[PDB]
Amino acid sequence: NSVPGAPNRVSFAKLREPLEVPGLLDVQTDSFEWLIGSPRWRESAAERGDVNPVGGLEEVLYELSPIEDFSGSMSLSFSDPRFDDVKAPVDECKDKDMTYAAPLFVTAEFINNNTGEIKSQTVFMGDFPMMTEKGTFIINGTERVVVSQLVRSPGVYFDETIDKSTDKTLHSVKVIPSRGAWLEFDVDKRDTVGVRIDRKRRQPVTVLLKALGWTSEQIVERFGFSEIMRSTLEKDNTVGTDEALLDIYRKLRPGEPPTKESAQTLLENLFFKEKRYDLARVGRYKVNKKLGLHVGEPITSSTLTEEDVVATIEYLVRLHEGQTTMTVPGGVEVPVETDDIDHFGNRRLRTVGELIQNQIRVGMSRMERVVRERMTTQDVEAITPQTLINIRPVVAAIKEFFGTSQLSQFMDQNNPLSGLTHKRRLSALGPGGLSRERAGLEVRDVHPSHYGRMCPIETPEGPNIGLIGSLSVYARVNPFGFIETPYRKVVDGVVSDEIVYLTADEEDRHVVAQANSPIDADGRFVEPRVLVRRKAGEVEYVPSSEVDYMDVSPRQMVSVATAMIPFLEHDDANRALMGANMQRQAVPLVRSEAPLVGTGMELRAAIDAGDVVVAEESGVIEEVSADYITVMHDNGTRRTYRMRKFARSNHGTCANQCPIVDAGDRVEAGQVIADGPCTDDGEMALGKNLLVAIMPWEGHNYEDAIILSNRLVEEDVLTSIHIEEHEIDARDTKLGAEEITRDIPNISDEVLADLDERGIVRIGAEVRDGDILVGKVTPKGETELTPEERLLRAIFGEKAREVRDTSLKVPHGESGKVIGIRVFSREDEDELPAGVNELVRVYVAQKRKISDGDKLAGRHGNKGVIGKILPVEDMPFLADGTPVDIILNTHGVPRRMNIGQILETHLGWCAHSGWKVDAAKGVPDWAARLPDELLEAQPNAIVSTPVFDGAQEAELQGLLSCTLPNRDGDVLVDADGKAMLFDGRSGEPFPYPVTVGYMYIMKLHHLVDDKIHARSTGPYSMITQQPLGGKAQFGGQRFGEMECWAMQAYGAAYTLQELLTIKSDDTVGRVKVYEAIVKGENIPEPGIPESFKVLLKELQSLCLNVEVLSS
Amino acid sequence: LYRRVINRNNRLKRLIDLGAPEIIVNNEKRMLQESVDALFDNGRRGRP
Amino acid sequence: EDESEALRQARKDAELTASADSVRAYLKQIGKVALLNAEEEVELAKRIEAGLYATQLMT
């Protein structure tokens, strides 16, 4: 419910849930709004921390201003960031290739100190890119999304190691800041606590304390129990604060003549002045929590401090001593224990707001540097802030972050699910994050702190396994960047309805219950012993009195894409991973009917994906058509919504938007008003419902091969629309100017039939591989011709035709109609790149059918290519003559541990046929816990089994028992769930029953037409003379080292010589072999490879005399 | 890399035939040496 | 302290260093001679003028 136009999808959920699914795009929207300073974020923060609501831009300007000279006789300040209206709408930007942006305005104030003068000016910072209603950015027309990054929060981190030789514990600590230097206080094999600073290991803690100013008496007083530190004091062999500072300087600063005043300020600059050592607000908060300095002080003064350093040293020494709790003098007591990097109490989430804020800061640093540089050179009293400020570094930093940065990813859109799951994506790799080569196996693990904060299932299965994750459905992001998780607090065994958000630290501190705990429908637990997660991730049985927290609802630990998988709890983990990752590659079909059996996370996922038009204000439908909807609001005003008819997605898929309301209907604000690419009646639909058999059929469905009925081809059950675009620019040249015209040199009038008068093809004119799309000619220049060419030209009377033909030809292996032509020009004043006079885009769309080799997959990761499409007649059919549509293999089910597909098949058959529980004498025992309005269902009714609380196996058996007949008196499916199929090829019935049902399968984006490739002779590389690679160019297959090894091991020589010499590199050999093949002569002997010649030249260029000798 | 080698060699020649102090001449010679080292193997010694 | 050869020994040890950074080595190289004053510049310029007159009269 809670959606006005929600289709009635009956649910199998046993227990109610108190908390609804939050806004799935909050992680992006709230972050960017906090960056901006929007009133929505401002009032939210006022509700939750009104102490200091500061936006990202405000924080940057406040920490920058004021800017002083060395003399400090004059200053400049920034204040009051304020945005302007967007320069162009979203659709116009996407069409004309602009960037969705808005101007930035600030109030710069220039202040003189000696004389006294204020200069307030309105300064235009730059065109700030903006985030749309769907949480995505538009850069140069295309849509981009910046993924949140998982980085370890700065602070203190203690660990212990074993030396494995003397077998004694060696503790350590890393005070890792942001924008600063490192420093570690380890414990050695001996008892000399080292103070390695900036990777310079020497100089025990006594010298550091003396440099800070601590005398030996103070050191002993503060650390009396420390036998290790008293020993270091005894063997300090260095006395005197100035002597310690001298040692500090000679150690950390080799090659510089030390002085008694440079050393006195070097430590302060390195660790106490915020200019060069500024651990962020998160770092300060983490340090304060770890040591317990200030419990109520508002956070500020982000630089380190001597009390923090001495607290860290004392923490290290007490941890080595083996204490359990610590009390800093003047601070609360805090437990002492090692810290884990993989714990989500330390891995903060740097979202889009913080990423863009960091780029803004690094740009404004350059701007302030330029301001300071020009601020002294230019004469005083003659400058204004407009002359002072340079905004080019800031805008350049923004642009160079948005483009060419692997955290600003090309927003893949194969379906609304793909878009939604590309948002809410947590990537651990990126600038400032760990790379794949340095990514050890330790980080690619599901730490027990991930429960409810990151999906343990959904993650890429390739080389990026474990480095990329997605947020959970109920997860929320802390302002610092930690990931919160809602919980219902239970008090003295009374499960309350108050929801409290906890992070990893709080969850570890407290004791959490289980989501499916058997409550007594009153607040109490029926059984005192309940399942519990402990601090270390331990799972135990605990009396109900000690439990103080409980999960909001089941399926909280799982992400959206994985929550869309029915019967998940019966699947394995690897196959659930595959299904979750392969649910996001489904292509949009032309009908997109809703799935029969699914979960409750389809309607919410579809309407929160932003690819479905939804009425913002209630009213009555006035006018409805295939292009627009006019909703007549309750009060006078009207509003028109423009559908997107056949718009090209970023990955070449259809993006149709069909209305689902009539001319007299009334719609309430929030109702789905128009379908999307992969939607049906508002909810989600990634595929179709197909009749399913589990028998192995004549070896065509062998080893994950799939057989399809021809009915899918005939009725276009699985038929996708793909739109490809072609771009050709008629640009200026040195020898003249290229023009787009019909007159193409050395061409016939046959290929020009489809071309209009201005050169481009007609709209709706079909095209074939090798046709002409745009006729462009380039000035060829003056070139000498062969005498045979001269003789032919003289014979035929044809002229020189001094321009060259370079026309936009549709590449190899494409067909389909032409939808629309968008042509730009310089004469009509369009924003074109310099040097380009004419640009034209041609959109070609094809209606690809289903065919052998295409990849099909269910929702449980049972993938497989289409082996053979049989005709309708020769497919197994039930007793009533209905033929099955798909034929899986039985051998692939058990060894992959994914009987979730079998359960889904059974439930789908039950839903399609319709059932009726016969409660003539009481409700049957198996259906005792079944909810109401589920004992009987109409044929082709939809059901909804949630993720971890769904239909039970006993309930499935009971439903299969009552399977009311189709049209006559006939129950085609027995109690076991099988059926009597007849062989449509031979005729005799199959000797044993075979499972049948309605599984939900999807057409993946791995089509054959995008994969098939061939090459005989194409373009060649530049430095080496080997052929190119990839389907984009012509390219040839790579004959790798392993293939060479196999070729050698086969006892084979001549094939290897052929593939390595006269097929790849022999420049004077390829032409000879082609000529010999054409003329029918023997293949000539090969020559030495041009690659080997290049290697010889390189060796000679490396001052290595290499000479090849005959004898 | 070849441009840097050629530029530093030419500048060393100009300094030598003009007549320059030993500090500048040695600095330019070290410049040429480091440039040749970078050309032959970048990042082998020092910052790449 | 400022005496007892400790500071002097540290200074000479730090001066007899590697400084593999070429730029830093050049900076430490230039940071040897002290700065001058206008009278010293005038005297030096007079010396160069005398030297050039001397060599041209040799020629």
Cis, bond preceding A66 (omega within 30 deg of 0): yes
Q: Return the structure tokens found at A239.
A: 């006395």
Put simply, the answer to whether C17 touches A255 (Cβ < 8 Å) is yes
Query: Cα A631 to the chain's mean position, in Å?
Result: 36
Put simply, the answer to whether A250 touches C2 (Cβ < 8 Å) is no
- Helix intervals (H) in A848-978: 900-913, 953-961
Q: Return the structure tokens found at A10.
A: 């009956």
Question: What distance in Å separates the CA atoms of residue A13 and residue A554, rounded to the nearest whole number?
Answer: 10
Please state how this structure was obtained. cryo-EM
- Helix intervals (H) in A802-952: 900-913
- DSSP string over A159-188: EEEE-SSS--EEEEEEEE-SSS--BB----
To the nearest 10°, report the CA torsion of B13, B16, B20, B23: 80
Query: Cα A328 to the chain's mean position, in Å?
Result: 43
- On whether the CB atoms of residues A668 and A646 are closer than 8 A, the answer is no
To the nearest 10°, report the CA torsion of A558, A564, A568, A571: -110
Put simply, the answer to whether C22 touches B23 (Cβ < 8 Å) is no
Query: Coil, strand or helix: which one is A260?
Result: coil
Instruction: Pick the closest to residue A927 from A960, A963, A958 (CA basis).
Output: A958
- Give the DSSP H/E element, type plus range, for residue A496: strand A494-502
- Any A CB within 8 A of C11 CB: yes
Shortest CA gap B45–chain C (Å): 9
Say if strands A720-733 and A836-848 run parallel, antiparallel, or are unpaired. Answer: antiparallel
Put simply, the answer to whether A255 touches C13 (Cβ < 8 Å) is no
Instruction: Pick the closest to residue A623 from A676, A662, A668 (CA basis).
Output: A662
- Give the DSSP H/E element, type plus range, for residue A574: helix A574-582
Residues ≥6 apart with Cβ < 8 Å to A4 = A667, A668, A669, A670, A671
C-alpha atoms less than 13 angstroms from C-alpha of A380 in its C-beta half-sphere: 11
Question: What distance in Å separates the CA atoms of residue A845 and residue A867, rounded to the nearest whole number?
Answer: 26
| A580 DSSP 8-state letter | H
Residue carrying structure tokens 């660790």: A271
Residue A271: C-alpha distances to residues A14, A213, A279, A777 (Å): 58, 15, 10, 66
Instruction: Pick the closest to residue A248 from A441, A371, A238, A551 (CA basis).
Output: A238
Instruction: Pick the closest to residue A936 from A924, A918, A909, A921 (CA basis).
Output: A918
Helix, strand and coil in chain B, % to nearest 5: 75, 0, 25
Q: Long-range CB contacts (< 8 A, 24+ apart) of C24-29?
A: C24/A255, C25/B30, C26/B27, C28/A255, C28/A256, C29/B23, C29/B27
Instruction: Pick the closest to residue A560 from A614, A619, A604 (CA basis).
Output: A604
Burial class (CB in 10 A: 0-12, 13-18, 19+), A805: middle
Resolution in A: 3.4
Q: Return the structure tokens found at A441.
A: 């196996």
- DSSP string over A30-59: HHHHHHHT-HHHHHHHHHTTTT----HHHH
Say if strands A476-477 and A666-667 run parallel, antiparallel, or are unpaired. Answer: unpaired
Question: What distance in Å separates the CA atoms of residue A1015 and residue A393, rounded to the nearest whole number?
Answer: 48
Q: Return the structure tokens found at A479.
A: 């302002």
Residue carrying structure tokens 């260095």: A238
Interface contacts (B, C; CB < 8 Å): 12
Query: Coil, strand or helix: which one is C20?
Result: coil
Residues ≥6 apart with Cβ < 8 Å to A561 = A417, A421, A458, A470, A580, A581, A583, A584
Put simply, the answer to whether C14 touches A242 (Cβ < 8 Å) is no
Query: Coil, strand or helix: which one is A219?
Result: helix
| A1082 DSSP 8-state letter | P
- On whether the CB atoms of residues A155 and A346 are closer than 8 A, the answer is yes
Instruction: Pick the closest to residue A940 from A640, A648, A675, A597 (CA basis).
Output: A597
- Give the DSSP H/E element, type plus range, for residue A227: helix A227-234
Residue A436: C-alpha distances to residues A426, A439, A537 (Å): 15, 5, 27
- A243: closest chain C residue by CA: C1
Q: Return the structure tokens found at A368.
A: 């302030």
Query: Coil, strand or helix: which one is A982?
Result: strand
- Helix intervals (H) in A1007-1110: 1041-1049, 1054-1057, 1067-1079, 1090-1101
- C16: closest chain A residue by CA: A255
Please count the other Cβ atoms lying within 10 Å of the Cβ belonging to residue A732.
12
Angle (CA) A893 A897 A900, round 5° = 75
Question: What distance in Å separates the CA atoms of residue A513 and residue A490, rounded to the nearest whole number?
Answer: 9
The one-letter amino acid code at A456 reads: P
Question: What distance in Å separates the CA atoms of residue A976 and residue A963, rounded to the nearest whole number?
Answer: 12
Backbone phi, then psi, for A367, in 5-degree steps?
-60, -45
Chain C environment of A250 (Cβ under 8 Å): 10, 13-14
Please name the member of C22, C29, C30 whose beta carbon is closest to the beta carbon of B34: C22
Secondary structure of A615-665 in HEC code, one letter for each residue: CCCCEEEEEECCCEEEEEECCCCEEEEECCCCCCCCCCCCCCCCECCCCCC
Please count the other Cβ atoms lying within 10 Å of the Cβ belonging to residue A973.
20
Please count the other Cβ atoms lying within 10 Å of the Cβ belonging to residue A465.
12
Residue carrying structure tokens 């003789």: A791
Residue A238: C-alpha distances to residues A191, A249, A1025 (Å): 17, 14, 68
Chain C environment of A242 (Cβ under 8 Å): 1
Please name the member of C2, C13, C18 whose beta carbon is closest to the beta carbon of A260: C2
Between the two ends of chain A, the Cα-to-Cα distance in Å is 90
Residue A336: C-alpha distances to residues A304, A328, A844 (Å): 21, 12, 66
Rama region for A94: left / alpha / beta (φ>0; ψ in -120 to 50; rest):
alpha
- C31: closest chain B residue by CA: B23
Say if strands A886-887 and A705-709 run parallel, antiparallel, or are unpaired. Answer: antiparallel
To the nearest 10°, report the CA torsion of A470, A472, A474, A477: -50
Please name the member of C2, C6, C24 whose beta carbon is closest to the beta carbon of A255: C24
The one-letter amino acid code at A278 reads: D
Secondary structure of A517-550 in HEC code, one letter for each residue: CCECCCCCECCCEEEEECCCCCEEEEECCCCCEE
Burial class (CB in 10 A: 0-12, 13-18, 19+), A441: exposed
Q: Return the structure tokens found at A1081.
A: 């002569």
Q: Return the structure tokens found at B17.
A: 């035939």
Question: What distance in Å separates the CA atoms of residue A1071 and residue A1094, rounded to the nearest whole number?
Answer: 20
Residues ≥6 apart with Cβ < 8 Å to A210 = A216, A238, A240, A241, A243, A244
| A568 DSSP 8-state letter | G
Shortest CA gap A249–chain C (Å): 10
How long is chain B?
48
Question: What distance in Å separates the CA atoms of residue A54 and residue A300, rounded to the nearest whole number?
Answer: 13
Burial class (CB in 10 A: 0-12, 13-18, 19+), A1094: middle
> Which residues on adjacent β-strands are paired with residue A721?
A847
Q: Return the structure tokens found at A918.
A: 């016969």
Q: Return the structure tokens found at A29.
A: 């929207």
Query: Cα A880 to the chain's mean position, in Å?
Result: 48
Query: Cα B2 to the chain's mean position, in Å?
Result: 12
Instruction: Pick the closest to residue A527 from A538, A539, A550, A543 (CA basis).
Output: A543
